[PDB]
Amino acid sequence: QGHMPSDSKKPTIIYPCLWDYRVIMTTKDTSTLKELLETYQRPFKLEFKNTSKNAKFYSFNVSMEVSNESERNEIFQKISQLDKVVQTLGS
Numbered sequence: 001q002g003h004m005p006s007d008s009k010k011p012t013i014i015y016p017c018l019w020d021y022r023v024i025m026t027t028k029d030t031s032t033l034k035e036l037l038e039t040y041q042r043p044f045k046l047e048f049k050n051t052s053k054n055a056k057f058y059s060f061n062v063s064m065e066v067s068n069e070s071e072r073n074e075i076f077q078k079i080s081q082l083d084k085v086v087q088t089l090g091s
Contacts, residue, residue, distance in 0.1 A: 013069075017065065019065075020062070021088075021090060023062055023079055024058065024059050025058055025082060027058065030060060036075065037064055037075070043064075044065075045063040045064070046062060048060055057086060
């Protein structure tokens with residue numbers, strides 16, 4: 001009953017659009033990450049940003065077209081199913 005104010009309102013996101021995911025894995029052998037993307041049969045950008053000072057953590061950059069919010073979430077969930085990943089950033 002009742003409703004919250006319009007403050008802290010989540011902004012309108014225009015789908016479809018390229019969404020950016022940050023994937024930190026402890027391997028340079030990125031297969032599963034691209035595999036989960038390729039199943040959508042859509043193109044995607046695979047980038048390497050930087051690696052920790054011990055070369056232990058590899059920061060990967062993924063950017064793909066999401067047609068809706070459900071994809072945006074499910075894909076992010078697949079990113080955590082790699083196991084190689086130590087930290088997923090789904091901002």
